[PDB]
Ligand binder design. Structure first.
Ligand SMILES: Cc1cc2nc3c(=O)[nH]c(=O)nc-3n(C[C@H](O)[C@H](O)[C@H](O)COP(=O)(O)O)c2cc1C
Ligand SMILES: Cc1cc2nc3c(=O)[nH]c(=O)nc-3n(C[C@H](O)[C@H](O)[C@H](O)COP(=O)(O)O)c2cc1C
Ligand SMILES: [Mg+2]
Ligand SMILES: [Mg+2]
Lengths: 311, 311
């Protein structure tokens, strides 16, 4: 009942891991492939392998999580080699997603050029919102810089491309971003990356709980669902139909998934909840969403996709 | 134990209501005066009385609240007359706070001029984050416009003035705002107003829960504490000491209060929790904070104010 069409491709269900979670190594990726996830995405990569920030850099919270990973990854070549080898096997229903988060525009352009030149037939996700890179301002909050980068990207990148965006909190910003994005042959927008630079404190120790950036880190989980849903919905009503949406943020139960789909998301990514539960979460959440649909008499996501009602 | 000095004034404790909550009418204000709150602030006013947005416009949530009130208020003159009359009575320890949220710069300047010319001896709070006039942004998200307005304000306003700010999520933005604010003789910064334009959905009815703006509203409560604490802390380490901070966001327990104070807040405002519990919350939270201090052997807020530790 969850069969989904996205980026002109067929997926068994809309669920995927969120980049950054359970996708660092080939072993992680293989575990996602073996799981019930409809699709999966690689850890955002940089040209060079990165160790990331000092530990502790991730902490589970009652209402979600806080992290300042620092883009730890095994390097662009590592992930490209994996997806290219995996592609030849045809042992998977649906293309693999490849995330890139260059440390500079030049780095992103370089990686996109390599992807374009390679035989990669999957989907690419350009991360314009990493809030845990020491000394690096979320690009998607700089509308001028974002438009400039995308214009250069589309002068040569012809393969499926989506952008991972930070959350917006003002309607005028959604209007501005939508206007910018609508001029490009983008495949999708993925809302949202973590609510940036939040803080969690241990009152007993009177200290922060993560080492990097004096304790400031990206917030995920239940804390951000209202923001995530709003971003998915705001873009759904502003983006041209050619640009689909991936909903990310606060997805833990079938109900959370249902809500994102009602807003207009086509694919759904799970970060914090997957980090805590492991790949078994996909089978659980799929069944929860199916139960919700059965109760409502729905046999397809199309029966409610984007049908959120206003009062 | 909780005696606090702020804006060169003495307060019995740091707790106050957050503007917008329990401060619409004279009766509301009198109830806050009768409560254990160390100080209180009036509902953000506009030159003319406003009915606000259509109902439902406020909804209690498990993790906080969502609202799109629409600035309902009894008008500038109503609040000015109240504060001017109570001022003469000298029946209160600590000045009253007066919030203004004009829908245009011209409106804010007009109200500030009236306050300046009046005999008002209290503290004024300029709201630069009420998600007010469509085609906006929240003024404080427009750094250029914010600096321009403040420059004009300080060419004539000599009375105590603080600014109510929206939450920021990127360190560069804190740097930019701090640079702007540090050039003025501002009394304080109040972080934060609601996380803007969030969405809450009733999965059963497949609809939003508030009538205005297709269900989009400001998020408050537990959802926003990480963001609130981060904003208080980020400004505490960037603002010149002359500009103090009022911490607002997710304060429900003595522990939440303790955390805000550890970050650097001097005064504390309660919104959502006060909306749900009523003025009795002040006595409860004061006792909770005092218990925390007693356990740690602290007899003054100075024993831990702004002492949040990094790892
Ligand atoms: C440990 C961790 C690492 C992350 N690293 C990335 C990353 O490399 N690339 C990216 O686009 N998002 C990254 N994110 C953000 C997630 O993809 C997701 O947008 C966020 O966690 C919001 O979803 P959630 O509420 O399900 O956690 C990371 C999140 C976590 C918790
Ligand atoms: C019903 C309601 C009305 C509000 N109206 C105002 C307002 O007029 N002026 C203002 O500065 N903030 C207003 N706010 C925001 C609060 O002052 C406060 O910044 C926010 O609720 C975050 O605090 P909390 O987590 O304790 O709710 C309002 C909040 C609520 C819940
Ligand atoms: Mg599988
Ligand atoms: Mg009193």
């Amino acid at each position: 009942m969850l069969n989904t069409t996205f980026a002109n491709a067929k997926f068994a269900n809309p669920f995927m891991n969120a980049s950054g979670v359970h996708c660092m190594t080939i072993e992680d990726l293989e575990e996602l492939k073996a799981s019930q996830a409809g699709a999966y995405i690689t850890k955002s990569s940089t040209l060079e392998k990165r160790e990331g920030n000092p530990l502790p850099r991730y902490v589970d919270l009652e209402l979600g999580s806080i992290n300042s990973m620092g883009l730890p990854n095994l390097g662009f070549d590592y992930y490209l080699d994996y997806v290219l080898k995996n592609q030849k096997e045809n042992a998977q229903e649906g293309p693999i997603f490849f995330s890139i988060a260059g440390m500079s525009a030049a780095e992103n352009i370089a990686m996109l050029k390599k992807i374009q030149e390679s035989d990669f037939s999957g989907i690419t996700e350009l991360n314009l919102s990493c809030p845990n890179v020491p000394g690096e301002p979320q690009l998607a909050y700089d509308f001028e810089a974002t438009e400039k980068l995308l214009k250069e990207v589309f002068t040569f990148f012809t393969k499926p491309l989506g952008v991972k965006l930070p959350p917006y909190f003002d309607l005028v910003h959604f209007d501005i971003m939508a206007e910018i994005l609508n001029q490009f042959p983008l495949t999708y927008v993925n809302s949202v990356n973590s609510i940036g630079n939040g803080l969690f404190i241990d009152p007993e120790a009177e200290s922060v709980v993560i080492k990097p950036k004096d304790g400031f880190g990206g917030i995920g989980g239940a804390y951000i669902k209202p923001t995530a849903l709003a971003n998915v919905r705001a873009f759904y009503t502003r983006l041209k139909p050619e640009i689909q949406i991936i909903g990310t943020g606060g997805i833990e139960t079938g109900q959370d998934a249902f809500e994102h789909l009602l807003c207009g998301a086509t694919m759904l990514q799970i970060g914090t909840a997957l980090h805590k539960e492991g790949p078994a979460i996909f089978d659980r959440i799929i069944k929860e969403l199916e139960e919700i649909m059965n109760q409502k008499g729905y046999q397809s996501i199309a029966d409610f996709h984007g049908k959120l009602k206003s009062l």
